[PDB]
Amino acid sequence: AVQISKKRKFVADGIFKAELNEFLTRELAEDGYSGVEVRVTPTRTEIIILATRTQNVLGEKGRRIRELTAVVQKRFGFPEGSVELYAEKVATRGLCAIAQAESLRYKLLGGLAVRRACYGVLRFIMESGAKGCEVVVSGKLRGQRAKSMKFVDGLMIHSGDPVNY
Amino acid sequence: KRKKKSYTTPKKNKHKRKKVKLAVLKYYKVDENGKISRLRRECPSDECGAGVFMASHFDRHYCGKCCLTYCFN
Amino acid sequence: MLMPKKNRIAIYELLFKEGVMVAKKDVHMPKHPELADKNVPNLHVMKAMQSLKSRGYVKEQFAWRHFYWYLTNEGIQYLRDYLHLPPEIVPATLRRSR
Amino acid sequence: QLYWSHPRKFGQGSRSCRVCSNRHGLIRKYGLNMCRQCFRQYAKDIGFIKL
Amino acid sequence: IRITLTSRNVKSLEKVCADLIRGAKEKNLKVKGPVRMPTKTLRITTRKTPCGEGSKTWDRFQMRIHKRLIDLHSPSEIVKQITSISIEPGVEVEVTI
RNA sequence: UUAAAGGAAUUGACGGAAGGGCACCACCAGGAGUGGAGCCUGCGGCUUAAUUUGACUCAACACGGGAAACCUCACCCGGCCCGGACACGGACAGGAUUGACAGAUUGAUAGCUCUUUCUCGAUUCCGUGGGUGGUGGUGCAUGGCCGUUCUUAGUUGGUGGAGCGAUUUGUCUGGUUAAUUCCGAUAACGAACGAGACUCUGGCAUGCUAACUAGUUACGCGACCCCCGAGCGGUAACUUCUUAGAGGGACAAGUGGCGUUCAGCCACCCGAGAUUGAGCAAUAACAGGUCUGUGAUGCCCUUAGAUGUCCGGGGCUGCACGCGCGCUACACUGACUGGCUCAGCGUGUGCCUACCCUACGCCGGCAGGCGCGGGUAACCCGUUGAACCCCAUUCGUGAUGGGGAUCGGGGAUUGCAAUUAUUCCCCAUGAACGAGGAAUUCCCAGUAAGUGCGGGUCAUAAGCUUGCGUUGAUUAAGUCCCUGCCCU
Numbered sequence: 001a002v003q004i005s006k007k008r009k010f011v012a013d014g015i016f017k018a019e020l021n022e023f024l025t026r027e028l029a030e031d032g033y034s035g036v037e038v039r040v041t042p043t044r045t046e047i048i049i050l051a052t053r054t055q056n057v058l059g060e061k062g063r064r065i066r067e068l069t070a071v072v073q074k075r076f077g078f079p080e081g082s083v084e085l086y087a088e089k090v091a092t093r094g095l096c097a098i099a100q101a102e103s104l105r106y107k108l109l110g111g112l113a114v115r116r117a118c119y120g121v122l123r124f125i126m127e128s129g130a131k132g133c134e135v136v137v138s139g140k141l142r143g144q145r146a147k148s149m150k151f152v153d154g155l156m157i158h159s160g161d162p163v164n165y
Numbered sequence: 166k167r168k169k170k171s172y173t174t175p176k177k178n179k180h181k182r183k184k185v186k187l188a189v190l191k192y193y194k195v196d197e198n199g200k201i202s203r204l205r206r207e208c209p210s211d212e213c214g215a216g217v218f219m220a221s222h223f224d225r226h227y228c229g230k231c232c233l234t235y236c237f238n
Numbered sequence: 239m240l241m242p243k244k245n246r247i248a249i250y251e252l253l254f255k256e257g258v259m260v261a262k263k264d265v266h267m268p269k270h271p272e273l274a275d276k277n278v279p280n281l282h283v284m285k286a287m288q289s290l291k292s293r294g295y296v297k298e299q300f301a302w303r304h305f306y307w308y309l310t311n312e313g314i315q316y317l318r319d320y321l322h323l324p325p326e327i328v329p330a331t332l333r334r335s336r
Numbered sequence: 337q338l339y340w341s342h343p344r345k346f347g348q349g350s351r352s353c354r355v356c357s358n359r360h361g362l363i364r365k366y367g368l369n370m371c372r373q374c375f376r377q378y379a380k381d382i383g384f385i386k387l
Numbered sequence: 388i389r390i391t392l393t394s395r396n397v398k399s400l401e402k403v404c405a406d407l408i409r410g411a412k413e414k415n416l417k418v419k420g421p422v423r424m425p426t427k428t429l430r431i432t433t434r435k436t437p438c439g440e441g442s443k444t445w446d447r448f449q450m451r452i453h454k455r456l457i458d459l460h461s462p463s464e465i466v467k468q469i470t471s472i473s474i475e476p477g478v479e480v481e482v483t484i
Numbered sequence: 485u486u487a488a489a490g491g492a493a494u495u496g497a498c499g500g501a502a503g504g505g506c507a508c509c510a511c512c513a514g515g516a517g518u519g520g521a522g523c524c525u526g527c528g529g530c531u532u533a534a535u536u537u538g539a540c541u542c543a544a545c546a547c548g549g550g551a552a553a554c555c556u557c558a559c560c561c562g563g564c565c566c567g568g569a570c571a572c573g574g575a576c577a578g579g580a581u582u583g584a585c586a587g588a589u590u591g592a593u594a595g596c597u598c599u600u601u602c603u604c605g606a607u608u609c610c611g612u613g614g615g616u617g618g619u620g621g622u623g624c625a626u627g628g629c630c631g632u633u634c635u636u637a638g639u640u641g642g643u644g645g646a647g648c649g650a651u652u653u654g655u656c657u658g659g660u661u662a663a664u665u666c667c668g669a670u671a672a673c674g675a676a677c678g679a680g681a682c683u684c685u686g687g688c689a690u691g692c693u694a695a696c697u698a699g700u701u702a703c704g705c706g707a708c709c710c711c712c713g714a715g716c717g718g719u720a721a722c723u724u725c726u727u728a729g730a731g732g733g734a735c736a737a738g739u740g741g742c743g744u745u746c747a748g749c750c751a752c753c754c755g756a757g758a759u760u761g762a763g764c765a766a767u768a769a770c771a772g773g774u775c776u777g778u779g780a781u782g783c784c785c786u787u788a789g790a791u792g793u794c795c796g797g798g799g800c801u802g803c804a805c806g807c808g809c810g811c812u813a814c815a816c817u818g819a820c821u822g823g824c825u826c827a828g829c830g831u832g833u834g835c836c837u838a839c840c841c842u843a844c845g846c847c848g849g850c851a852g853g854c855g856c857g858g859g860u861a862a863c864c865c866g867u868u869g870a871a872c873c874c875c876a877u878u879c880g881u882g883a884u885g886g887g888g889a890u891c892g893g894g895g896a897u898u899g900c901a902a903u904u905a906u907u908c909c910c911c912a913u914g915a916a917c918g919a920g921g922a923a924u925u926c927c928c929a930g931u932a933a934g935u936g937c938g939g940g941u942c943a944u945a946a947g948c949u950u951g952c953g954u955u956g957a958u959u960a961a962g963u964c965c966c967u968g969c970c971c972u
């Protein structure tokens with residue numbers, strides 16, 4: 001019985017997309033998380049999670065995806081099973097820089113020092129069809145001062161409109 | 166900065182509340198080996214005085230669950 | 239300080255029914271918004287779930303104001319002690335699937 | 337127990353942000369609750385571009 | 388009876404407009420034109436910085452809300468038949484009888 | 485007495501050294517100004533219990549979108565709550581574990597404490613360890629973000645030459661351009677980031693695509709006048725006017741001249757334009773700011789009378805002072821009164837959690853109140869009947885009717901509460917100010933400036949800021965003289 005305007009429903013949907021995507025990249029840092037594609041349908045609210053390692057999404061016995069469905073439905077207000085999640089496999093592991101930094105986080109936590117880890121991820125990204133890559137690591141790196149370690153290979157465009165896509 | 170909030174205690178070194186009572190609390194009276202005489206006045210029928218009794222005051226009364234005030238000269 | 243027994247069985251009954259709990263950060267100081275599922279707003283919910291997140295029973299997540307609570311198979315193995323009170327029923331997360 | 341006085345139905349304290357409950361910085365009235373710092377990073381996710 | 392197609396971006400707008408006109412040409416309905424609406428824009432200006440150092444350097448964030456309306460006098464069964472559309476997710480559909 | 489003093493040679497940086505170019509954060513010819521007066525808003529210093537703090541040349545000083553009665557609040561005074569998770573363990577109350585009626589004190593009906601004694605009840609209370617919270621310190625530990633070096637065009641590896649070497653050649657004698665932009669020569673070749681190219685806006689146009697949530701032409705319903713078929717307004721076709729979808733249109737193309745074959749430069753016309761304004765913007769750094777935006781974080785500090793959090797007052801607004809950004813005047817090109825007439829961005833409701841846009845009618849002189857309706861929006865505000873501007877009266881060079889600061893009384897609105905801040909309206913009080921010294925800021929065409937409106941905080945709330953409109957200058961289109969930059 002309530003409604004909101006076109007000038008506010010779009011920014012509410014955008015905050016919904018940002019909320020869902022950033023909370024899934026918060027708590028799903030284990031597997032290879034690329035992004036989500038949420039479709040609009042007045043019968044079933046479809047949420048398509050595109051992931052690299054779909055095993056953590058699908059769970060053991062089909063548990064974690066239904067648990068994420070419950071996480072969405074018990075706050076965002078969609079009863080009677082309105083929200084339905086579908087997982088998609090991403091065959092190109094080295095295509096998503098979000099997934100590459102997501103793997104690099106857990107590789108740099110448990111040992112696997114910065115030099116050899118950067119050479120390994122640059123070798124993997126260069127093997128996975130990419131034309132150019134750049135990894136910048138900043139912070140306390142073998143010293144009390146902050147030394148920005150940059151590792152760049154290939155062809156990288158830094159200026160203009162098509163940088164974002 | 167270099168500000169400081171320390172202890173001066175101008176007024177009192179006060180403390181909090183701790184409920185202290187006797188060993189047990191008896192409310193009844195033994196008469197004729199089986200008849201109980203009532204000592205304290207009950208509370209009226211407002212879903213309070215089914216098992217809640219009034220506290221002894223000079224002219225006031227008190228419901229424990231519902232805090233009812235009754236006064237008589 | 240004693241929570242009512244209806245709340246102390248009801249929040250764990252809701253956790254038994256679903257397994258996913260949701261609250262927010264707003265503890266009572268600007269406003270008193272009651273919970274969309276239960277009666278107590280946030281403080282008794284946090285006091286009930288801190289004993290689960292302290293002993294490693296139910297995991298904790300945060301989405302910009304909101305505490306989400308995450309269920310584990312080991313979480314159900316430790317909540318078996320609460321499962322002694324009903325008959326042995328796996329909640330609607332693990333047993334059945336469509 | 338007098339827990340909730342000063343009902344806070346107006347002004348600055350009534351504006352509580354969706355991001356980190358920021359209340360010193362302002363919160364815009366656009367159908368939106370951001371902190372003006374994280375809005376820069378999150379505008380490309382919620383649908384705003386620079387042009 | 389009117390149908391409003393409100394899109395997020397111009398390419399999906401023109402794709403769903405071309406698909407809807409292509410699906411509406413073959414039927415025996417006097418199909419009105421895809422009436423163009425003025426594009427809405429929510430301009431937001433931001434300080435770019437948490438602390439005030441440097442020049443007054445401001446952001447300019449915008450959206451482009453695009454909208455189209457058509458008029459189709461039809462019975463409700465034919466309207467519900469036309470309603471089933473394989474559609475881009477960036478397009479919202481509203482109907483009014 | 486000392487661990488260096490030295491020699492060529494390589495790369496920065498510097499030169500009040502030379503050569504070639506660039507820039508209104510530089511100048512010339514100028515325009516508007518500040519610094520003079522009043523006021524607003526910040527900074528330093530004073531005063532206090534506190535007058536919270538960061539930032540100190542561009543690269544701080546209406547900046548923290550920092551417009552505070554408590555809210556924000558981080559600062560002083562008083563008072564409550566533990567949200568003290570959790571492992572062991574003390575009383576274990578033979579079950580009394582924490583909420584309280586009335587009286588004294590305290591703003592409080594705070595069970596804060598005391599007199600008094602009822603109550604949900606194995607959650608308790610306390611100790612030993614750990615944990616949590618902090619707008620506490622540390623940006624000279626940091627991440628992220630921003631600004632600056634630098635809005636100038638510069639930067640780099642692979643192979644191969646020179647040198648033992650740091651390095652250099654590629655990255656240039658010359659011409660040209662906004663450009664390391666290109667042509668050319670060349671111990672270099674093939675390359676890369678950057679500049680351009682990219683995206684949006686503005687300029688022209690289709691009788692292509694279309695419109696009852698936007699209009700036109702005639703036509704009727706239909707009010708008025710001459711009454712002579714005319715003229716102003718209210719209520720079948722296609723997009724010219726409002727909107728954008730595709731495509732086009734502009735590329736120094738055509739002509740003359742200068743230039744080396746070239747690269748390019750100047751004037752014409754067709755054209756709407758012989759190119760507008762923004763965004764993104766390289767390598768490497770500042771020991772630039774932010775721990776006071778984050779449950780972003782390392783170390784230290786406090787954790788029970790709390791540096792955690794609530795409640796009630798004050799404060800950041802306090803002034804013998806100096807400084808910065810701004811608003812209004814110093815009048816006659818004007819001030820007052822009356823009439824006339826024009827817009828564009830953009831905003832608006834029952835919100836992922838408390839809120840507007842207001843039309844019409846009545847009442848009051850006024851700010852305002854009441855009844856009712858529309859708008860979740862090209863529907864209604866709204867054809868935003870806006871200000872300057874276009875005409876008529878009054879004023880007459882007088883600190884004057886310019887200026888409205890200061891101060892007194894009253895009336896309405898939001899808010900629980902405006903008095904040591906709301907805001908607005910009515911009367912009255914009527915200072916300084918006579919176009920501003922030393923010095924200094926911005927700007928080349930719809931440009932500066934005059935003037936008004938929308939958004940941000942908003943509840944009341946703009947003199948700030950971002951954008952939009954109306955009118956719209958003078959004069960350069962050159963230079964490296966002051967300042968600064970790029971390459972030898």
Ligand SMILES: [Mg+2]
Binds near residue numbers: 138148
């Ligand atoms: Mg860095």
Ligand SMILES: [Mg+2]
Binds near residue numbers: 492
């Ligand atoms: Mg020498």
Ligand SMILES: [Mg+2]
């Ligand atoms: Mg000059």
Ligand SMILES: [Mg+2]
Binds near residue numbers: 517
């Ligand atoms: Mg001035």
Ligand SMILES: [Mg+2]
Binds near residue numbers: 519
């Ligand atoms: Mg001055």
Ligand SMILES: [Mg+2]
């Ligand atoms: Mg002055």
Ligand SMILES: [Mg+2]
């Ligand atoms: Mg400091």
Ligand SMILES: [Mg+2]
């Ligand atoms: Mg904090």
Ligand SMILES: [Mg+2]
Binds near residue numbers: 623
């Ligand atoms: Mg620093």
Ligand SMILES: [Mg+2]
């Ligand atoms: Mg830093």
Ligand SMILES: [Mg+2]
Binds near residue numbers: 624771
């Ligand atoms: Mg420093």
Ligand SMILES: [Mg+2]
Binds near residue numbers: 634
């Ligand atoms: Mg740069």
Ligand SMILES: [Mg+2]
Binds near residue numbers: 647
């Ligand atoms: Mg050599």
Ligand SMILES: [Mg+2]
Binds near residue numbers: 655
């Ligand atoms: Mg070189």
Ligand SMILES: [Mg+2]
Binds near residue numbers: 723724
């Ligand atoms: Mg047209």
Ligand SMILES: [Mg+2]
């Ligand atoms: Mg922690």
